[PDB]
């Protein structure tokens, strides 16, 4: 059922590490995440996986 | 600095590097930070992008 109930809530980050060549390249696609980074935001993991 | 230019100062150019965090001055656009090849397309009247 938990399994269930994680398949339906579609996460926006799916894992909190992005390094700097993944943006460099594919900079042809206009990511959401990449351009929050180039700008100073970010966002912090939870305390509890 | 919004459209293709050909009535220049005195300044002399230097070669292009690529992939190093760099000061630019790109016809007069100066700025700073690292250049890599692009597969954007552009028209003949367009010389920016934002």
Redesign the interface.
Known sequence: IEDLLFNKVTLADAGFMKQYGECLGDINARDLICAQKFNGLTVLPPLLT | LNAPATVCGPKLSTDLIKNQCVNFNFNGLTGTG?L?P???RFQPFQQFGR
């Open positions: 690292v890599t692009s597969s954007k």
